[PDB]
RNA sequence: GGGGAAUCCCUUCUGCAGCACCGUUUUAGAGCUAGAAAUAGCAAGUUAAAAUAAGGCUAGUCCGUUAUCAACUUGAAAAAGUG
DNA sequence: CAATACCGGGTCTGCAGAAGGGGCTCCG
DNA sequence: CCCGGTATTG
């Protein structure tokens, strides 16, 4: 009884099949449990588990951190109120109480309904004096009068509750506020540097031009237009562009011949500038510093739209300017509409359902929707010119709380808050005492490297405390151990050295690590000259001289430099051939040069006695992000450097960690030699052993010490091991389900393990990332293509338009512009032709006018194209509009193009699976099946695990006409698993040598020919072979081209396949999140315990975690007469814990009396019920059902539908295509037959009378359509019959809306079916017998 | 052939922490005039408070949406067993 | 109860890791 | 997107 298993692992299915050595699927009588009259049932050993996708933890995390934010914001307000408590109680002992109950209806309020002053006269007067809170804030900042303590509170609380972002470090410099003054500063600095060509900036209103609500490039154009003799690409123009936030290239200004682009926003700018100043000189540093200051002022002027010399509240003044312009323009608009369009006034100003002013203020119309609505109304009237300008500036009738206030820094709000505190502390002493406390409430921020301020009950926290006491914003530095916490943040996540598992890894930018990388690469360099017999390694002295002369004088070392500045200069070689390195060295001493620029003491860096110190310094710079903490840690070294050097040091920062520890690189020593790994890399006689050789050499202690260093740990469980794999959670859910399926199948075969297990794994918002990429790329390029052709993210899902923007509107193979309106006439071409690499991503595609201009089609684009286009391609690459892989493949021709080795490798890659995750699946199954060791203590591999790629079975299907149509039913998953088992077992029976390629555990033209013809033994004629294929050595039959194909056909024709939908409890959010207005409906759910939804609104649409079958009695009528019921009650996610804690009490609270506790049945989503005539339903919820049957369409119809619809591609030969076409035409009647099938099924099982009649009518309407189109729309038709939830579909232009099953009553008397994972073991419960 | 390691350039995905801005909901921001009222005419509108999973105990400036789940028997449970 | 229709909260900064092309020096 | 909740209309 030998058998194999085939598995098809996906993100929503695991297909499975059992085969015998004859490639047949067995069938068994399985026992049926329960209370029906059926005791057993015949099952085929083939099927597929279906499940909803496993989800990532991201949404859960976003909601978790948002929860924390709400908690802490409330705590800020609570701190402020605790500071105000006593004095407020003297002024008004219920102010804070009225604030707390402001949400309650007057009936529920325990105090006066007017929050601020508690009487209507004073409240109305307040709102009249201060129509916005920004009025009050400006008044309290500017006035010198004693203010009412309640108004002071409201201003401070408003600033603290909505406090602005923390994107900018430090204080908001008052020097860099004025645009005019900083523009003059930049001009003065430039004219200092360029006395012969000064700039005349008098009469230039720099403020108006540079702060105008316009695009960066337009403002640059305007300013340059105010300067005759100066162009926007000259030096001053580039400085202005850098100030405005563009990415100017200073290459041409300073004649660099190598690009020097600068963007103040990028993280690398600080180095980029220091990279430019290195080539230009340090006299230009003040010029770029002036540019940065001007940039800060322009950024501020974006938010502060008012003069900062009439008020210390420019932000509140700008909000008040919004309010005043809103008022004036609304008065004008009302007057103009009343005069010119009186009939539209009611709609514009009263109808909240429309997107006019009423919908804008009272309805749900956004600012953008209101603009779009009212723009034509302004265009049709006269006197609306300035209003239209404001609308196009997005500056018309604005509110003050708006989507763009995210631009406001917290330093602005802090300025206003501090000003108020300074005004009013002269009258309230508790404000003087607590001023810094209140400022700290605004400014204090839990660092991202500290985490939740927990006390042992958070699986997320890592913060440690210096003293056990409550943490507040004011004692945080004293109570939280910031250093230990920031260190734990990183060290919970960084790797240990795999060779020394108790050793932490070195910083990536450590001096020792970079020395290691440089010497490890340098020991394998070889050189040869004329008088040398063979190439020679570099000696220790030569390597040391190369490091001291080249690596310690240049950031990068090229082969050319090696030849000229070392071999010529030192060794007196005029010609030398180098091997082991190409073009330039990969490793380099970048940290050495950074630190040499900072400390300016080469002798310090070269003195080994400072190694420790330098290591620690880099450690600090890597471990911490906060510059104050960095300075604290570096303090011990302050006596070694000047204070300017210390400031430069603490401004330097690094990130990233290496792969090896310090103890491995330069700690452990070979016993005999006394040398470390790095010692050997610096000098190792004439063997020049590199790292791998060193740790694998039996004549050194390194291997032995690495072996001893391995430590034991607690082995993960199966679920733990699967969760810790690298991959999407969806594929991991599939992986675990696969293991459980295999366990059940082995149990089904009497605990006999299979001979083979063949596994195949499936291959695998968005427009937002596409838009992001195109925006950043065009910005880096400096192109105007988005100005001339604006595009929304959705449109970028079109392949050709996306490619058009990625290529900056140009042909990729020809130096010409493309025309947008002509995309349909252009071609999308594969860089590496798809006949070698099946890659259809953007990474292997380009848009070109005509693909013929690539060159020959049998290779990579020609060398001529590369010569033409390489510089444009490099510009695209630096703009991130193409990747390094795309650039390398486009330019491969100059490197020889595609070789025969490359093509053979491409074919092998197409056939042999090499993904790490599939290898991990194979290892899991192999270690579970094979557990015994032989006399040599090697594993006994009694079960062979074979991995296949989908292409093998796909090609098998297409070659032998075992076609698949995914839409017909779910059987194709199971058929895939079956064909996987067949092909894999036959393949390794035919070529056992292939086991290394395909079984887990253990000339170019020739291999190309071989792997391209590996599946020919199935065929009868090629491009002829015997009818019986055998193994050449064992002589055993592997394939019989008579019976075995008929066996496969019989398997695929079997109507009884075990499709099982995994029943799952539902988890997640309680309900829809929308907070609905109050309504007289029991559907509403209170958002807080006492917030009666009929008064306060609430949620609806809760999610049912699972249903429950209740047999009980319910009171009926006014008399409350008990009546027996049997019904389905949906337990919601929110109710689940309460129901499970005590079900009887819960059901009695819901109204059920005398519950039959032992008759309660838990019914998760997709619980299966069978009714009459084989009709099946699945539970969608407590009140809705899903389709429960599979339509087993016969195989001839499936193949006719595949051929008639042109499913996939025809391929083959024209004669075979003609035979397929003649088959389609000879079996046209199949169409009607297929329809009949559907109809029959729909009448037995679906019961959608109206939809079925509409479908039959639509089919009889398009009987004159081409056979191909009728076949495609018949493919569409199977949505009516598919398993699962009903869904709308389209037959030609007719739309069929889904017929839903809006009642679950019938299943309460049907047969409930409990299924095991394979569906082979069943328990059937007749529910009509309950009650 | 298979498996593995460091470096370089890129790319994708996964996990975690810390912020901001809005949105929504109820209340507050005295609507006026005529008319008995039904209604009509006009005025007005930009702001705020509070909640933002119900909530929980472990009471922290913590936790509350990921993963995992046929049924039956034995078991508090974990888990084991059952064709 | 049937047919039908509408609806659904959203976007940053920072850190660490695995793994996929392309290359290169090595190991078992 | 999808598909289960809800209301409307009957
Ligand atoms: K009251
Ligand atoms: K000019
Ligand atoms: K609105
Ligand atoms: K190189
Ligand atoms: K750092
Ligand atoms: K010093
Ligand atoms: K779940
Ligand atoms: K889910
Ligand atoms: K590698
Ligand atoms: K099940
Ligand atoms: Mg809360
Ligand atoms: Mg709001």
Written in H, E and C, the secondary structure of A33-57 is EECCCCCEEEEECEEEEECCCCCCC
Contact A316, A415 (CB under 8 A): no
- Which tokens sit at A190? 């430039």
Distance, CA of A670 to CA of A668 (rounded, Å): 7
How are beta strands A13-20 and A1311-1315 bridged, if at all? unpaired
Tally of CA atoms within 13 A in the half-sphere of A78 that contains its CB: 8
- Which tokens sit at A1141? 């804690």
CA nearest to A1165, candidates A1146, A1184, A1137, A1147: A1184
How are beta strands A1121-1132 and A1104-1116 bridged, if at all? antiparallel
Calculate how far, in angstroms, residue A662's C-alpha sits from the geometric centre of ligand 6.
29
Contact A1282, A1162 (CB under 8 A): no
Which nucleotide across the nucleic acid strands is nearest to A537, CA versus C1'? C25
CA nearest to A1031, candidates A994, A986, A990, A992: A990
Q: What is the DSSP letter of A19?
A: E
The three state secondary structure string of A682-741 is: HCCCCCCCCHHHHHHCCCCCHHHHHHHHCCCCCCCCHHHHHHCCCCCHHHHHHHHHHHHH
Contact A622, A507 (CB under 8 A): yes
Which residues, in sequence order, are bridge partners of residue A1291? A1294
Distance, CA of A971 to CA of A656 (rounded, Å): 48
Distance, CA of A1017 to CA of A1038 (rounded, Å): 10
Distance, CA of A595 to CA of A650 (rounded, Å): 11
Calculate how far, in angstroms, residue A666's C-alpha sits from the geometric centre of ligand 5.
24
- Kindly report which amino acid residue has its CA closest to the C1' atom of nucleotide B5: A692
Q: CA A107, C1' B31: Å apart?
A: 23
Note residues around ion ligand 1 (Cβ under 5 angstroms): A 109
Calculate how far, in angstroms, residue A357's C-alpha sits from the geometric centre of ligand 12.
19
How are beta strands A1104-1116 and A1168-1170 bridged, if at all? unpaired
Which residues, in sequence order, are bridge partners of residue A611? none
Tally of CA atoms within 13 A in the half-sphere of A350 that contains its CB: 6
Stretch (H or E) spanning A7: strand A3-9
CA nearest to A678, candidates A689, A656, A657, A539: A689
Contact A513, A658 (CB under 8 A): yes
- Kindly report which amino acid residue has its CA closest to the C1' atom of nucleotide B16: A460
Within residues 1130-1169 of protein chain A, the ones with CB less than 7 A from nucleic strand D are 1130
Q: What is the DSSP letter of A355?
A: S
Tally of CA atoms within 13 A in the half-sphere of A784 that contains its CB: 5
Q: CA A369, C1' B40: Å apart?
A: 31
Q: Where are the alpha helices (DSSP H) in A169-305?
A: 179-193, 206-211, 216-225, 235-244, 251-254, 269-280, 285-303
Calculate how far, in angstroms, residue A1157's C-alpha sits from the geometric centre of ligand 10.
23
Calculate how far, in angstroms, residue A67's C-alpha sits from the geometric centre of ligand 11.
7
- Which tokens sit at A530? 């004329």
- Kindly report which amino acid residue has its CA closest to the C1' atom of nucleotide C13: A167
Cβ contacts of residue A1044 below 8 Å, gap of 6+? A22, A23
- Which tokens sit at A368? 């953008």
Return the SS3 of A1160.
coil
User: Could you say which ligand is closest to the alpha carbon of residue A623?
Assistant: 5
Contact A505, A613 (CB under 8 A): no
Nucleotides of D under 7 A from a protein CB: 2-7
| Strand D contact with A1285 (CB < 7 A) | yes
Q: How many CB atoms lie within 10 A of CB A247?
A: 18
How are beta strands A756-761 and A944-948 bridged, if at all? parallel
Q: How many CB atoms lie within 10 A of CB A187?
A: 21
Contact A960, A949 (CB under 8 A): no
Residue indicated by tokens 């200069």:
A569
Stretch (H or E) spanning A1290: strand A1289-1291
Q: What angle do CA A6, A974, A1019 make, to 5 degrees?
A: 70
Contact A974, A1057 (CB under 8 A): yes
Q: CA A178, C1' B25: Å apart?
A: 42
Which nucleotide across the nucleic acid strands is nearest to A1071, CA versus C1'? B53
Calculate how far, in angstroms, residue A401's C-alpha sits from the geometric centre of ligand 12.
7
The three state secondary structure string of A905-974 is: HHHHHHHCCCCHHHHHHHHHHHHHHCCCECCCCCECCCCEEEEECHHHHHHHHHHHCCCCCCCCCCHHHH
Tally of CA atoms within 13 A in the half-sphere of A434 that contains its CB: 18
Residue A1327 backbone phi and psi in degrees, to 5: -80, -20
Q: CA A1094, C1' B37: Å apart?
A: 29
Distance, CA of A323 to CA of A321 (rounded, Å): 5
Sheet strands (E) in A1051-1201:
1058-1061, 1104-1116, 1121-1132, 1152-1153, 1161-1163, 1168-1170, 1176-1179, 1185-1187
Contact A23, A1018 (CB under 8 A): no
- Which tokens sit at A312? 């210390």
- Percent helix, strand, coil in chain A (nearest 5)? 50, 10, 40
Return the SS3 of A405.
helix
Which nucleotide across the nucleic acid strands is nearest to A409, CA versus C1'? B20
Distance, CA of A1031 to CA of A987 (rounded, Å): 10
Contact A1309, A1328 (CB under 8 A): yes
Which nucleotide across the nucleic acid strands is nearest to A491, CA versus C1'? C16
- Kindly report which amino acid residue has its CA closest to the C1' atom of nucleotide B46: A399
Q: How far does Cα A698 stand from its chain's mean position?
A: 46
- Kindly report which amino acid residue has its CA closest to the C1' atom of nucleotide C14: A448
Contact A682, A544 (CB under 8 A): yes
Distance, CA of A603 to CA of A923 (rounded, Å): 53
Q: How many CB atoms lie within 10 A of CB A216?
A: 16
Cα distances (angstroms) measured from residue A106 to each of A99, A114, A116, A362, A1078: 13, 10, 15, 22, 16
Q: What angle do CA A844, A847, A851 make, to 5 degrees?
A: 90
User: Could you say which ligand is closest to the alpha carbon of residue A659?
Assistant: 9
Angle between helical axes of A863-878 and A766-781 (0-180°, round to 10): 100
Calculate how far, in angstroms, residue A1316's C-alpha sits from the geometric centre of ligand 10.
5
Tally of CA atoms within 13 A in the half-sphere of A73 that contains its CB: 13
Distance, CA of A880 to CA of A781 (rounded, Å): 10
Stretch (H or E) spanning A1038: strand A1037-1040
Q: CA A5, C1' B83: Å apart?
A: 21
Return the SS3 of A24.
coil
CA nearest to A290, candidates A389, A214, A394, A179: A179
Calculate how far, in angstroms, residue A1069's C-alpha sits from the geometric centre of ligand 8.
10
Distance, CA of A126 to CA of A1221 (rounded, Å): 84
Q: How far does Cα A823 stand from its chain's mean position?
A: 30
| Strand D contact with A1182 (CB < 7 A) | yes
Distance, CA of A1260 to CA of A941 (rounded, Å): 60
- Which tokens sit at A1299? 């017929």
Distance, CA of A247 to CA of A241 (rounded, Å): 7
Q: CA A327, C1' B34: Å apart?
A: 29
Calculate how far, in angstroms, residue A599's C-alpha sits from the geometric centre of ligand 6.
12
- Which tokens sit at A583? 């073009």
Tally of CA atoms within 13 A in the half-sphere of A136 that contains its CB: 21
- Which tokens sit at A837? 């690499």
Q: How far does Cα A695 stand from its chain's mean position?
A: 39
Return the SS3 of A215.
coil
User: Could you say which ligand is closest to the alpha carbon of residue A585?
Assistant: 4
CA nearest to A614, candidates A630, A591, A632: A591
- Which tokens sit at A298? 């322009």
Distance, CA of A1247 to CA of A1234 (rounded, Å): 18
Calculate how far, in angstroms, residue A715's C-alpha sits from the geometric centre of ligand 2.
72
Return the SS3 of A16.
strand
Calculate how far, in angstroms, residue A761's C-alpha sits from the geometric centre of ligand 8.
22
- Kindly report which amino acid residue has its CA closest to the C1' atom of nucleotide B64: A64
Return the SS3 of A1153.
strand
Tally of CA atoms within 13 A in the half-sphere of A421 that contains its CB: 24
Q: CA A55, C1' B15: Å apart?
A: 13
Which nucleotide across the nucleic acid strands is nearest to A59, CA versus C1'? B65
- Which tokens sit at A744? 């059940």
Order of all β-strands in the sheet with A13-20: A944-948, A756-761, A3-9, A13-20, A46-50, A1058-1061
C-alpha radius of gyration, chain A, whole number: 38
Q: How far does Cα A1008 stand from its chain's mean position?
A: 38
Distance, CA of A259 to CA of A250 (rounded, Å): 7
Contact A890, A866 (CB under 8 A): yes
Contact A703, A696 (CB under 8 A): yes
Q: CA A77, C1' B52: Å apart?
A: 16
Cα distances (angstroms) measured from residue A920 to each of A337, A942, A953, A988, A1001: 71, 19, 22, 21, 12
Chain breaks in chain A (C to N over 2.5 A) after: 764, 1002, 1023
Residue indicated by tokens 């079996």:
A1227
Return the SS3 of A554.
coil
Distance, CA of A652 to CA of A771 (rounded, Å): 33
Sheet strands (E) in A514-636:
526-528, 536-537, 577-579
Which residues, in sequence order, are bridge partners of residue A44? A27
Distance, CA of A1194 to CA of A1240 (rounded, Å): 14
CA nearest to A242, candidates A270, A265, A225, A221: A265
Contact A495, A703 (CB under 8 A): no
User: Could you say which ligand is closest to the alpha carbon of residue A162?
Assistant: 12
Cα distances (angstroms) measured from residue A203 to each of A209, A227, A237, A241: 12, 10, 17, 20
- Which tokens sit at A901? 């080795």
Q: How was this structure determined?
A: X-ray
Calculate how far, in angstroms, residue A690's C-alpha sits from the geometric centre of ligand 9.
15
Cα distances (angstroms) measured from residue A245 to each of A239, A591, A952: 10, 30, 53
Q: How far does Cα A104 stand from its chain's mean position?
A: 42
Distance, CA of A576 to CA of A563 (rounded, Å): 7
Torsion over CA: A491, A493, A494, A496 (sign): positive
Q: CA A1163, C1' B80: Å apart?
A: 25
| Strand D contact with A395 (CB < 7 A) | no
- Which tokens sit at A1232? 């009607």
Specify the length of chain A in residues: 1331
- Which tokens sit at A853? 């201009």
Return the SS3 of A639.
helix
């Amino acid at each position: 009884k030998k058998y194999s298993i085939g598995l098809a692992i996906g993100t929503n299915s695991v297909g499975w099949a059992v085969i015998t050595d004859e490639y047949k699927v067995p069938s068994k009588k399985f026992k049926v449990l329960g209370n029906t009259d059926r005791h057993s049932i015949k099952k085929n050993l083939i099927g597929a588990l279906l499940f909803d996708s496993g989800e990532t933890a991201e949404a859960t995390r976003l909601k978790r951190t948002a929860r924390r934010r709400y908690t802490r914001r409330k705590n800020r307000i609570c701190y402020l109120q605790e500071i105000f408590s006593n004095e407020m109680a003297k002024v008004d002992d219920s102010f804070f109480h009225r604030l707390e109950e402001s949400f309650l209806v007057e009936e529920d309020k325990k105090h006066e309904r007017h929050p601020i002053f508690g009487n209507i006269v004073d409240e109305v007067a307040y709102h009249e004096k201060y129509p916005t809170i920004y009025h009050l804030r400006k008044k309290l900042v500017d006035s010198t009068d004693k203010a009412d303590l309640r108004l002071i509170y409201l201003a401070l609380a408003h600033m603290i509750k909505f406090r602005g972002h923390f994107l900018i470090e430090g204080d908001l410099n008052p020097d860099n506020s004025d645009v005019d003054k900083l523009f003059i500063q930049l001009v003065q600095t430039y004219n200092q540097l360029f006395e012969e060509n000064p700039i005349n900036a008098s009469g230039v209103d720099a403020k108006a031009i540079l702060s105008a609500r316009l695009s960066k490039s337009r403002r640059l154009e305007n300013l340059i237009a105010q300067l005759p003799g100066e162009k926007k690409n000259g030096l001053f123009g580039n400085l202005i562009a850098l100030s405005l936030g563009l990415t100017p290239n200073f290459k041409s200004n300073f004649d660099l011949a190598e690009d020097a682009k600068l963007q103040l926003s990028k993280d690398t700018y600080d180095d980029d500038l220091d990279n430019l100043l290195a080539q230009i000189g340090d006299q230009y540093a003040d010029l770029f510093l002036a540019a940065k200051n001007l940039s800060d002022a322009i950024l501020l002027s974006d938010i502060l739209r008012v003069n900062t010399e009439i008020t210390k509240a420019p932000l509140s003044a700008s909000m008040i300017k919004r309010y005043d312009e809103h008022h004036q323009d609304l008065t004008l608009l009302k007057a103009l509409v009343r005069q010119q369009l009186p009939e539209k006034y009611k709609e514009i100003f009263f109808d909240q359902s429309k997107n006019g002013y009423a919908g804008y203020i009272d309805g749900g119309a956004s600012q953008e929707e209101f603009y779009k609505f009212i723009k034509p109304i302004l265009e049709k009237m006269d006197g609306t010119e300035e209003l239209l300008v404001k609308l196009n500036r997005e500056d018309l009738l604005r509110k003050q709380r708006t989507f763009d206030n995210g631009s406001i820094p917290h330093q602005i709000h802090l300025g206003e808050l501090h000003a108020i505190l300074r005004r009013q502390e002269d009258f309230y002493p508790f404000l003087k005492d607590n001023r810094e406390k209140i400022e700290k409430i605004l400014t204090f921020r839990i660092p991202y490297y500290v985490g939740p301020l927990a006390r042992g009950n958070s699986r997320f926290a890592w913060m440690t405390r210096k003293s056990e006491e409550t943490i507040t914003p004011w004692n945080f530095e004293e109570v939280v151990d910031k250093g230990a916490s920031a260190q734990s943040f990183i060290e919970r996540m960084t790797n240990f050295d795999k060779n020394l598992p108790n050793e932490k890894v070195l910083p990536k930018h450590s001096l020792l690590y970079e020395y290691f990388t440089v010497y490890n690469e340098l020991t394998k360099v070889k050189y040869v000259t004329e008088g040398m017999r063979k190439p020679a390694f570099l000696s220790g002295e030569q390597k040391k001289a190369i490091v001291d002369l080249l690596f310690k004088t240049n950031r990068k070392v090229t082969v050319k430099q090696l030849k000229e500045d070392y071999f010529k200069k030192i060794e007196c070689f005029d010609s030398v051939e180098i091997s082991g390195v190409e073009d330039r060295f990969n490793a380099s001493l970048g940290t050495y040069h950074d630190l040499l620029k900072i400390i300016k003491d080469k002798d310090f860096l070269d003195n080994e006695e400072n190694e420790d110190i330098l290591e620690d310094i880099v450690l600090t710079l890597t471990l911490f992000e906060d510059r104050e903490m960095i300075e604290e840690r570096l303090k011990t070294y302050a006596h070694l450097f000047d204070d300017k050097v210390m400031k430069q040091l603490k401004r330097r920062r690094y990130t990233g960690w290496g792969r090896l520890s310090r103890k491995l690189i330069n700690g452990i020593r070979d016993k005999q030699s006394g040398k470390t790994i790095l010692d050997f890399l610096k000098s190792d006689g004439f063997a020049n052993r590199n790292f791998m050789q060193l740790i694998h050499d039996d004549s050194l202690t390194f291997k032995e010490d690495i072996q001893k260093a391995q430590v034991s740990g607690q082995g993960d469980s199966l679920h733990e091991h699967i969760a810790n794999l690298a991959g999407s959670p969806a594929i991991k859910k599939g992986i675990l389900q696969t293991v459980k399926v295999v366990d059940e199948l082995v149990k089904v075969m009497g605990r006999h393990k299979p001979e083979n297990i063949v596994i195949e794994m499936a291959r695998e918002k968005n427009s937002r990332e596409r838009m992001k990429r195109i925006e950043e790329g065009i910005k880096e390029l400096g192109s105007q293509i988005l100005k001339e052709h604006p595009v929304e993210n959705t449109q970028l899902q079109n392949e050709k338009l996306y490619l058009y923007y990625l290529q900056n509107g140009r042909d990729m193979y020809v130096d010409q512009e493309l025309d947008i309106n002509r995309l349909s006439d252009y071609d999308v071409d594969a860089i590496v032709p798809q006949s070698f690499l099946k890659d259809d991503s953007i990474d292997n595609k380009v848009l070109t006018r005509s693909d013929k201009n690539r060159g020959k089609s049998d290779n990579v684009p020609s060398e001529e194209v590369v010569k033409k286009m390489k510089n444009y391609w490099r510009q695209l690459l630096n703009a991130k509009l193409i990747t390094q892989r795309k650039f390398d493949n486009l330019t491969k021709a100059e490197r020889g193009g595609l070789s025969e080795l490359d093509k053979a490798g491409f074919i092998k890659r197409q056939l042999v699976e090499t993904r790490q995750i599939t290898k991990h699946v194979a290892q899991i199954l192999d270690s579970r099946m094979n557990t015994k060791y032989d006399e040599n203590d090697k594993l006994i591999r009694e079960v062979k695990v074979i991995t296949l790629k989908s292409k093998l079975v796909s090609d098998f299907r297409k070659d032998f006409q075992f076609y698949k149509v995914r839409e017909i039913n779910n059987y194709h998953h199971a058929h895939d698993a079956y064909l996987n088992a067949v092909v894999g077992t036959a393949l390794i029976k035919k070529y056992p040598k292939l086991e290394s390629e395909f079984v887990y555990g253990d000339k170019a033209t020739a291999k190309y020919f071989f792997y391209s013809n590996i599946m020919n033994f199935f065929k009868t004629e090629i491009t002829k072979r015997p009818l019986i294929e055998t193994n050449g050595e064992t002589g055993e039959i592997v394939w019989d081209k008579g019976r075995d194909f008929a066996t496969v056909r019989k398997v695929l024709s079997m109507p009884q396949v075990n499709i099982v939908k995994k029943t799952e409890v539902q988890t997640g959010g309680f309900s829809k999140e929308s907070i609905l207005p109050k309504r007289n409906s029991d559907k509403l759910i209170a958002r807080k315990k006492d917030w009666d939804p009929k008064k306060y609104g609430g949620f609806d649409s809760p999610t049912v975690a699972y249903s429950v079958l209740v047999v009980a009695k319910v009171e009926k009528g006014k008399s409350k007469k008990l009546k027996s019921v049997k019904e389905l009650l949906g337990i919601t996610i929110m109710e689940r814990s309460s129901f499970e804690k005590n079900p009887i009490d819960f059901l009695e609270a819901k109204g059920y009396k005398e519950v039959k506790k032992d008759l309660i049945i838990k019914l998760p989503k997709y619980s299966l019920f069978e009714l009459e005539n084989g009709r099946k339903r699945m539970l969608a919820s407590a009140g809705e059902l899903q389709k429960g049957n599979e339509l087993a369409l016969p195989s001839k119809y499936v193949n006719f539908l595949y051929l008639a619809s042109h499913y996939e591609k025809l391929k083959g030969s024209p004669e075979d295509n003609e035979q397929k076409q003649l088959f389609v035409e000879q079996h046209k009647h199949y169409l009607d037959e297929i329809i009949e099938q559907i109809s029959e099924f729909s009448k037995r099982v679906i019961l959608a009378d109206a939809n079925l009649d509409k479908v039959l009518s639509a089919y009889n309407k398009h009987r004159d359509k081409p056979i191909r189109e009728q076949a495609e729309n018949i493919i569409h038709l199977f949505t009516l019959t598919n398993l699962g939830a009903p869904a709308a579909f389209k037959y030609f232009d007719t739309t069929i809306d889904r017929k839903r099953y809006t009642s679950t009553k019938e299943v309460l008397d049907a047969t409930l079916i409990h299924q095991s994972i394979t569906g082979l073991y069943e328990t059937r419960i007749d529910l009509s017998q309950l009650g």
